[PDB]
Amino acid sequence: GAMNSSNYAELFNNDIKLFVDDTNVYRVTVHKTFEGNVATKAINGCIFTLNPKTGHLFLKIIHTSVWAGQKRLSQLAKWKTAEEVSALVRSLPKEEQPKQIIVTRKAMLDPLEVHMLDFPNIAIRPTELRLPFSAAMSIDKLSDVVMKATEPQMVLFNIYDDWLDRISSYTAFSRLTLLLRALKTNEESAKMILLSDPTITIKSYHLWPSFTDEQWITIESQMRDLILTEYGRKYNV
Amino acid sequence: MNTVPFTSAPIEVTIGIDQYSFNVKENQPFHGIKDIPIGHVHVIHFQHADNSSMRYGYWFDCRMGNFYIQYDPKDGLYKMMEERDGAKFENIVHNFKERQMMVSYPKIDEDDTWYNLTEFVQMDKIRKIVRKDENQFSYVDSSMTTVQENELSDPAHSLNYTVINFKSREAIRPGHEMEDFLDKSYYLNTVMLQGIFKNSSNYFGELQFAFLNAMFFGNYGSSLQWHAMIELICSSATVPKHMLDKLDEILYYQIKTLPEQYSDILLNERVWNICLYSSFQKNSLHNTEKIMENKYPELL
């Protein structure tokens, strides 16, 4: 069944599961042509496939060449997502294959279901949560590897850095979703908060700064404040 | 012209024969139905005055034997039976006619309705969907479930329609996931028509039989099956032209004959709207689209 606020701690039990977000698979800029018509130009995209318990991220880069000569690209993006997710599962040893895959957008259920017909015991689930994984391209290192790619490529990351050495998966995921929620609502402010202090660096093998525990508390409060202000502004409350 | 005599009518019941029906009172001297047109299947069906639940009935073809109805007070229902003694049967049928205790199959000569609803329905195929090979006729009722329904409990009493499932390996070739899901032509034409049904006439015959079971008994799994077989055709980009023209005629007469008050449960909004307005064959059902719009515009 669907994932929602009620059954939220199921994400951190010991049944392997992955989130799949397809929002950044098919990406375009829109521009005017010489004759004054509108045209699109695709840029490189990515599938965001994340194990919320361990932080393992399977970033499958979608090179613009995929789209060459294809029609109905937004529809095709969903099937390509499901093709690549299905290939990822096939590539994993049996004991690493997920028991559930949760898609962040309902339009992915049928494509993934059809591509996973070989795995009848992997459940494909929608979610009622409004997860901010579209903001993944606001993480500089992820955006950089997507835009530099010259061919299809799978890049692996731990989206939690080393946080799990000190905090639980539940807490780690709440931090991640808060950071991404903030990046989504006001990228410039969010990014200002994260880097303001030049003396807190991002390790070469990390995505986020090496904040101490106490600095994470200040950061998280600053992201909360950012998110609430933007809301009052959006709705005049 | 053939006859189905009735031994008696001990309980108040509404009897139907094909699209006609007659009220019969408890211990009224009703002794059968005569002048039944040879050359088609037929169905004789029942709904007791006391239980407006469990409509039930028997599919038969008079060329396959002499059949009659008898009430069973143990099992509480009108049963169809075969009389093997040909002379003993003409004898019953002639005495009852002489006494004029039989209704006449009330066919208008201008009317091809029953032909149009049963054009591809063959008794031999019915007996494979309703397996009970000691009788030449087939019992169906409101409550019987289909083989596909069972999979998601007594198989002796099942409707063994052909299982259709758009999200199955059968329906989807490995490597053509997207193509086959969006254009079911390979499932329709290679798997179903060439593979299983062998020809479109057997396919149309099961489709029509599923509709009739849904109409006459309110059998819900039959309604599911009728809709699935329409959707498979409408969701195929490549369909023989003869199938599309014949489908339009088939569906027209089915929609024409449906009781107006039942369109809510018997007609699946999503399928019809997709077939008539979104599918590859949106433009190929001109008569069916015209009667649906004028008779059930609400559903659309």
Curated annotation (Swiss-Prot), chain A:
Additional detail: Present with 468 molecules/cell in log phase SD medium.
Give the domain of life: Eukaryota
- Where does the record place the region RNase H homology domain? 7-237
- Cysteine disulfide partners in this protein: none
Query: From which residue to which, out of the full length, is covered?
Result: 1836 to 2069 of 2413
> Which cell locations does it reside in?
Nucleus
Name recorded for this polypeptide: Pre-mRNA-splicing factor 8
Q: Which organism is it from?
A: Saccharomyces cerevisiae (strain ATCC 204508 / S288c)
Complex formation: Component of the U4/U6-U5 tri-snRNP complex composed of the U4, U6 and U5 snRNAs and at least PRP3, PRP4, PRP6, PRP8, PRP18, PRP31, PRP38, SNU13, SNU23, SNU66, SNU114, SPP381, SMB1, SMD1, SMD2, SMD3, SMX2, SMX3, LSM2, LSM3, LSM4, LSM5, LSM6, LSM7, LSM8, BRR2 and DIB1.
Protein role: Functions as a scaffold that mediates the ordered assembly of spliceosomal proteins and snRNAs. Required for association of BRR2 with the spliceosomal U5 snRNP, and the subsequent assembly of the U4/U6-U5 tri-snRNP complex. Functions as a scaffold that positions spliceosomal U2, U5 and U6 snRNAs at splice sites on pre-mRNA substrates, so that splicing can occur. Interacts with both the 5' and the 3' splice site, as well as the branch region. Has a role in branch site-3' splice site selection. Associates with the branch site-3' splice 3'-exon region. Also has a role in cell cycle.
Report the outcome of D21A. Alters protein folding. Severely impaired growth. Strongly reduced growth at 35 degrees Celsius
Domain remark in the UniProt entry: The MPN (JAB/Mov34) domain has structural similarity with deubiquitinating enzymes, but lacks the residues that would bind the catalytic metal ion. Contains a region with structural similarity to reverse transcriptase, presenting the classical thumb, fingers and palm architecture, but lacks enzyme activity, since the essential metal-binding residues are not conserved.
UniProtKB/Swiss-Prot annotation, chain B:
Q: Which InterPro entries does the UniProt record give?
A: AAR2, AAR2_C, AAR2_C_sf, Aar2_N, AAR2_N_sf
Chain segments carrying region Leucine-zipper: 244-265
Q: Which residues carry this modification: Phosphoserine?
A: S236
Q: Does the keyword Membrane apply?
A: no
Positions of post-translational Phosphothreonine modification: T257
Q: Which UniProt keywords apply?
A: Cytoplasm, mRNA processing, mRNA splicing, Nucleus, Phosphoprotein
**Where found in the cell?**
Cytoplasm; Nucleus
Residues in coiled coil: none
Swapping S236 to D/E leads to an effect described as: Disrupts interaction with PRP8
- State whether keyword Nucleus applies: yes
Q: Which CDD domains match?
A: Aar2_C, Aar2_N
Of the GO CC terms on this record, one is: U5 snRNP
Q: What GO biological process terms does the UniProt entry carry, in alphabetical order?
A: spliceosomal snRNP assembly; spliceosomal tri-snRNP complex assembly
Q: Which domain of life is it from?
A: Eukaryota
PTM note says:
Phosphorylated on serine and tyrosine residues.
Q: What is its main location?
A: cytoplasm
Q: Which family does it belong to?
A: Belongs to the AAR2 family.
Miscellaneous notes for this chain? Present with 7330 molecules/cell in log phase SD medium.
What role does it play? Answer: Component of the U5 snRNP complex that is required for spliceosome assembly and for pre-mRNA splicing. Involved in splicing pre-mRNA of the A1 cistron and other genes that are important for cell growth.
- Summarize subunit and interaction data from the UniProt record for this chain: Heterodimer. Interacts with PRP8 (via RNase H homology domain and MPN domain), competing with BRR2 for the same binding site. Component of a U5 snRNP complex that contains at least the U5 snRNA, PRP8, SNU114, AAR2, SMB1, SMD1, SMD2, SMD3, SME1, SMX2 and SMX3, but is not a component of the U4/U6-U5 tri-snRNP complex.
List the protein's name. Answer: A1 cistron-splicing factor AAR2
Organism expressing this protein natively: Saccharomyces cerevisiae (strain ATCC 204508 / S288c) (Baker's yeast)
What gene name is listed for this protein?
AAR2
